[model samples]
Target: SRYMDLKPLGCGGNGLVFSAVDNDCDKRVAIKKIVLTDPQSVKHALREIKIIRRLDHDNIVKVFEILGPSGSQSVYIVQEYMETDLANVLEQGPLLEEHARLFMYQLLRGLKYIHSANVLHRDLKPANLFINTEDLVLKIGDFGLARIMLSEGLVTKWYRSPRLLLSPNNYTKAIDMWAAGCIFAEMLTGKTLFAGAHELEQMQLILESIPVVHEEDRQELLSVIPVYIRNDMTEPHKPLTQLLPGISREAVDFLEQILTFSPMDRLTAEEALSHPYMSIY
Candidate 1:
């Protein structure tokens, strides 16, 4: 894994990811090394990695090998490499309607594949969803966050649904779809749809859209959210047209369908695939 020169893809407290060439196999690859200072974390991550290894899908990032232990406290994960991720693309600018439609479809397709395996991405943000602009191919990466127990995880939230924030115990794969909806909006607007300073603020940002959960879950969410905010949700609304000015009616309808306040109300990944918005492509 070391023979080929590597440029750092990213580096952080959790570990480092590098773009490199594996001359033995004559191909390019992504190299990830996790600094295993915590035994519990190491165990948790390994299980998720094992689960991903057993998975097969064009939209899923492929893990080629464990390579070897880099040192006493770390091991290397060698896998498929991509040029960049959706976050960087959005940084360049918002995607065109054609690009957004395809990217969003690929995301749902990938999510559908993983969810069918009974695996929740747990974390689905632009940064973790790798993209290749040349072909507009997107692959879901960084699975196992739910199992990893990383210190810097979902507690500090963005792209997390109110259901998970209010009652972590009461949740389902719907969380991933909500996050996907957030990304869809971002792709169209070139800005995060909800830029919340904290979890409470984030919930408020989301409330700007749906405002209130229907009948059943509303009672439970009300217990956590102050009564005033619940009333505010009833106040008025931010039209999807406001968020996505130039977007099509079909696309607008699609976003509204999936970004529902209640999990049960949200569209499934499989369901989104057949929607008119995606059917265009």
Candidate 2:
């Protein structure tokens, strides 16, 4: 009964998130509600909530408390409220180098820690990334995908990895890395690198930008290839340098490493953190 001032924040296919005050601590926080409509839903919600509870990091959103009893129809996840999200900030334009570098580093740092704990943030997009406007500090939030199965418009199509686009079951930590690469590119250019309308178009957009350099990667795609893609649809590659002309080499190189079609070729979060692009911060 402590929470007060329920202000609606946003809602989607996931659920509703609202800003509220916790009287016990006299602090403002954001509360996310998940409806446990079924036994299976409850099982998934509890497991995902537990994952957030065990995680503690500066760049990872903090879950202050979880309320609602075991058999309750609703569960509340309380967390620190941020003023804005990356998507909102990027509306004006791309971030300056200084901000982009630091934000990217923080994202990598958070991802590295989470990967070490053996958790995969299957849903990673600009909207899920929160930013404190005053200090420009960024934190990764919105773990609702952890509780639900993959469905249309659930996971963003743009940031989805090539492997995931081909085979949903083939996802790994690399999917997160690929999303991070997309985030980095967006921050640098203020535009989504691959703005495709559908899954086929999305894969085609990716292939047009970067050729499948690895033989194994090509073989995998060939095996899962559809008739449309099999019509010799591969287009001439446009290098990262050509696509993002004004950015530094390190930035392009980093994008290249993680944006590879093969999950096996993509850099791990820990490895990405150690790359030259991250050395600045």
Candidate 3:
């Protein structure tokens, strides 16, 4: 009735993840145990459960059960165990075109579903993408920072939109789109597209890669940030071809749309899913 309980699979910022066998189901599962002594930890655990409950898609990780002591120090959430995450895969090497397309399509599809439900996954990164061993399907996981985007608010520093960098407290769904674009780039290149040491550097990376604002859009962009954060910028469209050699033009175009400086200019997840680049496969 019971099988071996293996060692923990991995550990991250919040809690430890373990690979265990479900004695009743006779299948392997991942147990995410969060020590809930602290208020923040409890809040994170609850949020993870709420997000997982709301999401129901093949590309999203499934939460099978929740285990915790009625009055214990920690809580455990059981989910279908995945083989590895995108971060681990990237560590091996850059993804081939086929694999990249497969992963990207699934990622965007999941995002589209989330957005349709009015939920914004503030933390979309390679590390959060889980790969199914049986079907090789990509599943989005880790919703500790996920929130309903009723209004503007900063998502995350690394995946943050240009507008969020200047004023993180005031952002929009465009923030998630920017992160998706960055993740797509990372998968193809096997590295973070915008690895900045600070906020200023991150903004510079965005401007350099995407269509930089000229006199037409400069004033609008400057209005979002303080005068001190604003700097003289030029319009140098470094085509995706330059950043990712041999990538298809269509793919480059899609990336450009999502990484645009203005949030309003970025394409929605639904629109991105229908783009020519994704339609290829």
Clashing pairs in 3: 152-171, 153-171
lDDT of 3 at 229: 42
lDDT string, candidate 1, 52-151, tens digits? 7777788888888775564221777777988788888899888887888898999899888878877777668898888877887999885543332245
lDDT of each: 0.77, 0.80, 0.74
The full ranking of all candidates by lDDT, starting with the best, is: 2, 1, 3
Give the TM-score comparing model 3 with the true structure, all chains together.
0.84
C-alpha positional error of residue 186 in candidate 1 after TM-score superposition, expressed in Å: 0.4
Per-residue alpha-carbon lDDT of candidate 2 for residues 1-281, written as tens digits (9 for 90 to 100): 67888988997444689998878787789988888777987877867876887889999988888887442328888889998999999999998877888898999998888877877787788988999989889999847334222466655689888878878665577788899999999999999999987898898788777767666766776676644345343344576778998988878887888877777778988888788778657
Highest TM-score model number: 2
What are the models' TM-scores?
0.89, 0.89, 0.84
Q: Which candidate, 1 or 2, has the higher lDDT?
A: 2
Error of 3 at 155 (Å): 11
Task: Give the deviation of candidate 1 from the true structure as CA RMSD.
Answer: 3.0
Query: Clashes in candidate 3: how many?
Result: 2
Q: Which predicted model would earn the best lDDT?
A: 2
Tens digit per residue, CA lDDT, model 3, 1-281: 23356578877555788898867687888877788767876876787677777678888888877767542227777778888898899988788867888888998898888777777776677888899757879988854436664112332357777777777566456777888888888888888887786788887676766665545467665665445244556444564568888677766777888878777678898888888878665
